[PDB]
Structure 1
Amino acid sequence: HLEPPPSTFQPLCHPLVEEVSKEVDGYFLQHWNFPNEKARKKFVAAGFSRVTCLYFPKALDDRIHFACRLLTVLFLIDDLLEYMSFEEGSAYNEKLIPISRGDVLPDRSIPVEYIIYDLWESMRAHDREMADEILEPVFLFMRAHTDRTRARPMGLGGYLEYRERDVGKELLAALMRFSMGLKLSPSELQRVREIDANCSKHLSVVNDIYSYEKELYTSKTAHSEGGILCTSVQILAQEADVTAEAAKRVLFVMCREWELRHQLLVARLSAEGLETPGLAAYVEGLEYQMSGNELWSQTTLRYSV
């Protein structure tokens, strides 16, 4: 068992979590091609809409389902990439990218193609400007999964710099602002770069801590490239010469330090005359992401079995 160190962060969940979950899970159970009944049940047990609501608890009620659909299909895609090579995985992603832009019509016989297409079409229909600001961060997220730097040795420092793209920090930032209708100026976005980077490390490592057993199993049974083990747990275990479980406890303490740094960075942003009302809502949203990511990771069957 793993006991989480004390946190001042209060995780919040979107009030419409039960409705949207039943709705979005239902959609994918109708359209997505699951290999068997076991995969369908494991899909529901994962609670991909539940993590989305924990990520963006203050999302607008008519925009939360968009986020739940996007994160869900991205989870399904990334799980498929683990059985492919870097070459096969790259081809899979790059085929869905112009479709995501809406430049290429989808193959209605291929579930992943029209699901992706209809989603982005529906999102651009609701808010064209904000939905377009999610495209490139998503593409950055997807292309990071087939980056060949995963096949090269990394220290803790270089790993965190790479994982900011692999965890989709920028993707989650754009998705959050979209779902909340929270618009920020380029001056405001640049203003909280350091807060973003600190938040990204928290999201990545917390995920690493709870998803380690799943990824460790994948690295032994799946493809040698797509299922390769790339996590801070393994890296810290190597460099410090301790068990992976020991690395988890140490990394968890480090996460609490990043939470502290988040509070100080926000305080300094407020001490200086730089904290606009939009920024206050943004950094508060980032906190929800960090605590929301932890809560879900602690409880989902995706990681416990």
Structure 2
Amino acid sequence: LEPPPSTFQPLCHPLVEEVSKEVDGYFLQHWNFPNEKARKKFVAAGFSRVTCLYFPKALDDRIHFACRLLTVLFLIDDLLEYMSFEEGSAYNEKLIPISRGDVLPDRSIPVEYIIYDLWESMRAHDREMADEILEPVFLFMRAQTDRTRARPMGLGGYLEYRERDVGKELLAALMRFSMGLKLSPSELQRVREIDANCSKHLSVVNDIYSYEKELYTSKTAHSEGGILCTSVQILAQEADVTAEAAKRVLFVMCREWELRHQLLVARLSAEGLETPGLAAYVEGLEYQMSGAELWAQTTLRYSV
């Protein structure tokens, strides 16, 4: 599968080696892997490597929080494949008060106390921005078990939904957190179009490289939790072509959203609307788009 040209240049955080070994070790110490094989697979996926690709301009003392959050959010995304919607919702909902720091963790259950301890250290470092990540996270978590996954969706319907299930807002607030990027409500409203456009790129690039994994998941895991929900499948059905054909067509569209991103950014500069904070923000969203693509191409998580 050959990717079409992109003008984007992915960047990686300079401390990716240290921070990855640090956060990897942590999870190998506290998390519950079924066997040595699953432990090996976990390190292979490179969950801190991708976090360092999403947020290459992260503050050095802050990047490790993001790796931690995204790692466990990744570990859970996989576990939900083997539950029903009910089971999966119950699972997520228990973690939400713990995340607010409202209910203590059952310290026998790794996921409970890992999440509790994460959010506490985050609020300790920067309470205000830490707190602005909470609702975007929950929004994502409740999307993961939304019954709309079991209803037929067209392309537009799907992207509307995937904006939550792919975690666009949570990634945005985590980005802002990890950089210390403070934006007024004015500025944040000002770029809703750029967000929406960027969300489609993140969704579809991921749909393209993870399709094979997800096809096998839809055959072997839970009939609800492992349900096949992807633009690849939708487009394949609608255009009556193979998934491989659909991938190639969706990749060209992703490049159109990149171009559209440059256009919107340029236009926002063509008024005084591009504040310095906003400028660093939309540069940030470009790192996410390109970074996620670089990782998706090279991670063992998707070529297996």
TM-score by length of 1: 0.99
Shift of 1:277: 0.2
Shift of 1:43: 0.2
Unaligned runs of 5+ in 1: none
**Separation of aligned partners in 1, 2:121 and 2:245:** 45
**Separation of aligned partners in 1, 2:271 and 2:235:** 36
**Separation of aligned partners in 2, 1:68 and 1:193:** 26
Count residues with an aligned counterpart. Answer: 304
TM-score by length of 2: 1.00
**Separation of aligned partners in 1, 2:135 and 2:214:** 26
**Separation of aligned partners in 1, 2:231 and 2:197:** 15
RMSD: 0.3
Partner of 2:123: 124
Shift of 1:108: 0.6
Unaligned runs of 5+ in 2: none
Q: Runs of 4 or more off by more than 6 Å in structure 1?
A: none
Shift of 1:220: 0.2
Deviations 1:234-289 (A, max 9, x none): 00000000000000000000000000000000000000110000000000000000
**Separation of aligned partners in 1, 2:18 and 2:3:** 30
**Separation of aligned partners in 2, 1:166 and 1:145:** 6
Partner of 2:3: 4
**Separation of aligned partners in 1, 2:214 and 2:131:** 32
**Separation of aligned partners in 1, 2:75 and 2:88:** 13
**Separation of aligned partners in 2, 1:143 and 1:32:** 23
Shift of 1:31: 0.1
Deviations 1:143-196 (A, max 9, x none): 101000000000000000000000000000000000000000000000000000
Shift of 1:214: 0.5
Deviations 1:68-106 (A, max 9, x none): 000000000110000000000000000000000000000
**Separation of aligned partners in 2, 1:219 and 1:83:** 10
Shift of 1:107: 0.6
The DSSP-based 3-state class of the residue aligned with 2:301 is helix
* 1:188 and 2:187 correspond: yes
The DSSP-based 3-state class of the residue aligned with 1:163 is helix
**Separation of aligned partners in 2, 1:62 and 1:224:** 42
